[PDB]
Amino acid sequence: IIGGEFTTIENQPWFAAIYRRHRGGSVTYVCGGSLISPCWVISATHCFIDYPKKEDYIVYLGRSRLNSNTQGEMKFEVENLILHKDYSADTLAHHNDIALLKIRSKEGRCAQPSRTIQTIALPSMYNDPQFGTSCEITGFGKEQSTDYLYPEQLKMTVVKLISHRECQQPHYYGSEVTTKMLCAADPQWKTDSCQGDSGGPLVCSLQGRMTLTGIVSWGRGCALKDKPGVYTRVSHFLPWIRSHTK
Numbered sequence: 001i002i003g004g005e006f007t008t009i010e011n012q013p014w015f016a017a018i019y020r021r022h023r024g025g026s027v028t029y030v031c032g033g034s035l036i037s038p039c040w041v042i043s044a045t046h047c048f049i050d051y052p053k054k055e056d057y058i059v060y061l062g063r064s065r066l067n068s069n070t071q072g073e074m075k076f077e078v079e080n081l082i083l084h085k086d087y088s089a090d091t092l093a094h095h096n097d098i099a100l101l102k103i104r105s106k107e108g109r110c111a112q113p114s115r116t117i118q119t120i121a122l123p124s125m126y127n128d129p130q131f132g133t134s135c136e137i138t139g140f141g142k143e144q145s146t147d148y149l150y151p152e153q154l155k156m157t158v159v160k161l162i163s164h165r166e167c168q169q170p171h172y173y174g175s176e177v178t179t180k181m182l183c184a185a186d187p188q189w190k191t192d193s194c195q196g197d198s199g200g201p202l203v204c205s206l207q208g209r210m211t212l213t214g215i216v217s218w219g220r221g222c223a224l225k226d227k228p229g230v231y232t233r234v235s236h237f238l239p240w241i242r243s244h245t246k
């Protein structure tokens with residue numbers, strides 16, 4: 001997250017921290033995710049497509065720092081890694097950038113909701129917020145495009161949704177951004193999601209309900225003028241999510 005503020009997991013309890021175990025035992029941070037039900041985390045296929053072995057992943061719920069075993073956190077392995085069959089990547093645009101991780105503890109259990117571990121509601125069909133609405137993003141991603149380390153403490157920020165007509169302007173993304181994608185950015189271009197925030201949530205308060213409107217997917221650079229963050233429009237994928245979690 002470029003700009004924004006530092007936060008803790010009690011303010012983002014649906015946030016899942018996803019790591020990968022390498023041959024030799026080293027563990028590194030991969031992407032964010034969101035808890036949609038006790039056994040299921042939703043994220044972005046681009047985070048996993050190059051290393052599609054479910055046994056390699058470690059998922060934490062209730063974790064506030066990259067390298068601290070936060071009090072109340074829960075550690076899981078991935079029982080099922082479901083990638084969207086029509087996923088693809090263009091130079092900038094990522095298509096069908098959505099994945100599901102069925103989680104299980106070493107005892108064979110799913111998440112136990114608590115003050116620091118909670119689900120996030122899915123949106124309803126054809127009902128996304130209007131352009132100009134403020135939404136929040138969360139993640140352990142880069143603080144500056146030039147950084148190589150990620151921040152130790154979880155971050156969040158707030159951005160505004162941008163219309164499809166505006167996002168398709170020539171100086172924005174033209175025809176590369178589709179109706180299955182949602183743009184969001186800062187009008188002053190000072191805060192945005194960045195590398196390492198992929199798969200994490202774009203949460204919008206809509207009609208009084210905190211909703212998982214988007215999943216961090218792609219963008220040209222980070223916090224660049226006329227280059228919004230681009231998010232998978234979760235409402236389009238409700239049939240796919242329902243069918244793959246039954």
Ligand SMILES: N=C(N)c1ccc2cc(C(=O)Nc3ccc(CN)cc3)ccc2c1
Pocket residue numbers: 046047049050192193194195196198216217218219220221222223227228229230
């Ligand atoms: N401007 C944004 N909001 C934004 C939003 C998301 C971003 C994602 C990546 C990134 O590194 N993506 C990526 C894509 C595919 C693969 C798999 N090879 C790995 C990483 C890099 C920069 C990003 C910037």
